[PDB]
Design a protein around this ligand. Sequence first.
Ligand SMILES: N[C@@H](CC(=O)O)C(=O)O
Ligand SMILES: N[C@@H](CC(=O)O)C(=O)O
Ligand SMILES: N[C@@H](CC(=O)O)C(=O)O
Ligand SMILES: N[C@@H](CC(=O)O)C(=O)O
Lengths: 326, 326, 326, 326
Amino acid sequence: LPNITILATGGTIAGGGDSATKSNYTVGKVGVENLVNAVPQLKDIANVKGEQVVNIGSQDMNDNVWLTLAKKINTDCDKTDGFVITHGTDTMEETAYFLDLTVKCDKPVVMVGAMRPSTSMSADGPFNLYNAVVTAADKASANRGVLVVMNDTVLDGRDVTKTNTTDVATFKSVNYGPLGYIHNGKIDYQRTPARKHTSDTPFDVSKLNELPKVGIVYNYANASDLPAKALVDAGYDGIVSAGVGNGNLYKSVFDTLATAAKTGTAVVRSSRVPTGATTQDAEVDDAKYGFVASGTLNPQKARVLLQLALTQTKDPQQIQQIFNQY
Amino acid sequence: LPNITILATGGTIAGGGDSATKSNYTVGKVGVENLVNAVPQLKDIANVKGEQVVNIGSQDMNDNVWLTLAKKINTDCDKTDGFVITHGTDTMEETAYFLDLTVKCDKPVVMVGAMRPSTSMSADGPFNLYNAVVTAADKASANRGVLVVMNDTVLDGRDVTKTNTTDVATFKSVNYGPLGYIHNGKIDYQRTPARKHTSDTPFDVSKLNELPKVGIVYNYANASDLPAKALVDAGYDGIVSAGVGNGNLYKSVFDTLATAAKTGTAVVRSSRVPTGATTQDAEVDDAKYGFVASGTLNPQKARVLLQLALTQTKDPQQIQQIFNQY
Amino acid sequence: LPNITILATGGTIAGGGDSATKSNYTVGKVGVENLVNAVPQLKDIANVKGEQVVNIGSQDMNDNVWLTLAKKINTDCDKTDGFVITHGTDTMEETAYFLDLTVKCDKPVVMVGAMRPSTSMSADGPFNLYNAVVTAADKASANRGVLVVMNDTVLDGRDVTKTNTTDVATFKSVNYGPLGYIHNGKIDYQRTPARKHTSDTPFDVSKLNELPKVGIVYNYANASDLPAKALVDAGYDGIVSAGVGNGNLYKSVFDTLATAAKTGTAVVRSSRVPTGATTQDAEVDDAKYGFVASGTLNPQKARVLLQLALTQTKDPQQIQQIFNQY
Amino acid sequence: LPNITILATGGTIAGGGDSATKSNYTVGKVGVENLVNAVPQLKDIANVKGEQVVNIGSQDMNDNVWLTLAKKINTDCDKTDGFVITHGTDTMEETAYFLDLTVKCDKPVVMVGAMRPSTSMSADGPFNLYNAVVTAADKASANRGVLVVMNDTVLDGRDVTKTNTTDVATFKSVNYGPLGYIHNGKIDYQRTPARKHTSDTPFDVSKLNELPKVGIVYNYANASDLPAKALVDAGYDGIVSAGVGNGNLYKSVFDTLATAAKTGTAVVRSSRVPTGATTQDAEVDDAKYGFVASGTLNPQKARVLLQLALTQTKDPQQIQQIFNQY
Ligand SMILES: N[C@@H](CC(=O)O)C(=O)O
Ligand SMILES: N[C@@H](CC(=O)O)C(=O)O
Ligand SMILES: N[C@@H](CC(=O)O)C(=O)O
Ligand SMILES: N[C@@H](CC(=O)O)C(=O)O
């Protein structure tokens, strides 16, 4: 049977409450060993090894953890046939894209979580974890980038996002769709991401202990420019605007970001709107102000790419080209 | 024929570019008179009167404009059979909910926009504006709250949101669905909002010249607490958190907001996730910290209700009850 | 505690396979007693009584079982506080609409099923059944018509349909949305159906032992008229066309159904397209041919309303009026 | 400038009504010359040549028109840089898949239609046709199989389906998503279909003047087996069942099709449910009965693949293999 390493970070898949039917719980309390032992069927499909990396709610995910995960995967690539990462669902879409750009291992890297705690009635985590190991053990899963497996579906790390606060079926690749569906332990793959990922990117975090500082500001009617000003005064390397509509900015925020771009802060226009691209050639003249349009990357994913872009260059033209290729 | 007043505020429905096939344009450049004259079919269904209120891109929408629109509608209620408001699509979902809570006129108030500029090939604005007048003239539309008409569909002001950056079909009521569909100028209504609206709310802005100051902060992996701190130091009356997952907060932001709530700042937990409710009884003990859970209101709509709540009370228990009724 | 009656009819909720991880299974093998004893927490929210009506896969649902169910609910209405019906998911949407038009009981009637068999890892039936009893016990559920509770959502019997062959989240009300969402045993209801239902219809099956015969034919490129002809030659009372697009018919099928409508067969145009209404006033002059347009009813739901209309009248004008009101 | 050939077949894109605001219209009345002259901007992006093949509503599409189209494209492949086919939207999804399996030309083949007639206010056909020519002229479009361009989106011919009866946004690839989105004349392609298409299939219709006869029967509660029986008695080569749920059949229809599969009729199980695969290994033992499971092909698309498979083989094992590869 294939050797599959489970790297555990916490999340509701490792969460517990006092009652099967009350909704209150805490995430990241159950160890990886107890996750594995609770699905004895794993032993028939894989030779499983579990490692606890951290045990937190992914609302508390941070750069230190990202860096650790990428180096761990790249270091151990040759010692296993695939990886499964258990993780909270709240920022899974961020971690998954970060690894999609920095992992240099060609073997399957599959992330998995649960929307209901392990103690819940009809808990979704056991069958998710099962399907994640199936996916990581399948030869067809290699070379597709970092993957997220939830609710019988295989999604790519770039497009996948959380679309509902509570539904087990919340994860969807809302612009370009999923890669495959799983039924009876077999995967019907009909798609693979076209944008460059993993060993095909120039991003290498093997020697880094810190990432550039990138913040996000939200736009809405009568938006305060105070959040944007605070990031600039604190010397942030980049700002991502969660803009309204097609990446548009409220007047005061636009003014602050235009000034910031001229003094060297990288600025990316994204959108609070959940689907579709923030494009060039709409209402904002990006070339005039030195802004970058994020394309289909939502604000939190645009932050991930901008941080990595900032380790290579500070030129907006160059950053735009990166946003057009990854 | 019925008397319908069009109150124009700008938007891409009044926007223009230099080419039918290039995507570049400016919003809010065409006067209301030219909008009306460009759809001569209006004259067969309604006695139309146009008034220009402002002419801006709704990315620049603000409290002054909201206040003006509500008082204008309430003042002129008895002089017309219905209202149509033309407006940019980027913040239409905010304005529509603000009017939904403050308009005291029982006659139909219908908002309408366009995703493609008036100069575009296959411009959607002419047929939208036609259907909006149809909806405002229909007796069945009364008493349903403020309405948004886009792409042959009648949506309620509370649930409606922009779901795509560029698609003509972008507006959807993503939690509870639309009220009606329009075909051949007739409306099949099968739903009406249950939450209290218009003349059934206690919100009255007739004597107000200013609203309480409410800002929004975004959460993501490694989120900065600097945006939250800046709002607090500037003495904001309320903050809305666009949280991850089911309204969760990154550790540093949670710390700052908990401290702020104890010194009197109203705090509401919402979610960057586009559908579903931010609930109580999940991972955050709202009663312990004095926080309010926003339910299905997304961050920008939760700001609208919080501002109005703050003109009546500062008690979190009371504000939670308001979030449970409106 | 409320008294709740569970009427069991079979389905995958009562289905079983030989392995927790293989997909093969048979439906309708587990008795109602075992279903209930498997969810001990029901006894905290209701006094439950189980009755086995039949035990089948709902792909074999038929008129005799529908008539039995309606009569049994109407007869026992005053002996209980609410009903839950366990049922397969394949024709759940048909039965729910049939009961929505023939149940004269004012108490909540809630249907529930499961997409995974009871022996499956992460089986969804136990939490669905728990939620269905919560909904049947909730006073706010009354007077909303017959309801389907699946995946934490409360759906009305008219609009609900199965949208995916295998997903636990397959049930959606795809035209007008759900009525309510359940979280921690509490239901946020924001909608109720406007079309008339249960006690407000004129359909009474108390004295009927059979229903009018109504069959469905499908349209596609180069469609055979043989299926249509076979139903007319057999003397069917009505035929529903699952048309292409907005209820259109392939030419040979058109000719056959136009002739049948003239010699007295009732003909309803519906559509194989999963959302949106089949309307009047498009490419087919229904008035000339005596055809009825089904509005948002899909073919299998149109068949339900046509059968019941045919117990009251055979006039196409009157039938159109029924399709406009229920 | 590229040379692009438009092959016109009719449809609402070529449809006309008496009023810009009434919904009534007839399809297939405007000639190709008038379609092209109505979009003068085409001459800036391509050298266009129009040919009228037929002029019908696509509800009357048939095998003879399919065979004509495939042969005409394969014959003229080397005389042009790309093809656009104008077509009604009702069976667009059928024709596109048929051409996807039989076109041996490597150049882009793009289908396009309109949901509103050309005389309608805000008619969508002109911008769709413009975008379809842009797509056919783009080098990046080649080798992606046959494409459907509607509402600024590029969809593959296998997964695309009509999801709504009247919405301009009705076309979606509901299982695996779209290939690309068009903005300002530029296409962001992120996906290509994995299933084999065009020159990589063994289907060759160059010498055929008819196709095997394959009909479709629908399942629902109390379904009549008469439609199935009529097609068997008439000697049909194959029957596709639009099954309930995951390809299930009402008992009488099951018995009839199991008997037909034994006396040589090819039987494919598909589903009336609009998304998801009909799988093996659920409730029906296909191997015992000689049935084929259609996977994500819906009934009208399964009929297309079954007809073409039947020109190569009659063995159900081989046919299953074809359904697994194309
Ligand atoms: N708050 C949890 C949510 C979950 O895992 O579902 C987390 O992200 O860790
Ligand atoms: N930026 C424009 C977008 C639109 O109207 O579509 C506005 O909101 O005014
Ligand atoms: N064939 C099963 C499917 C299910 O229940 O999910 C049934 O309808 O009875
Ligand atoms: N019946 C018309 C519908 C359309 O084109 O939109 C056709 O398919 O030809």
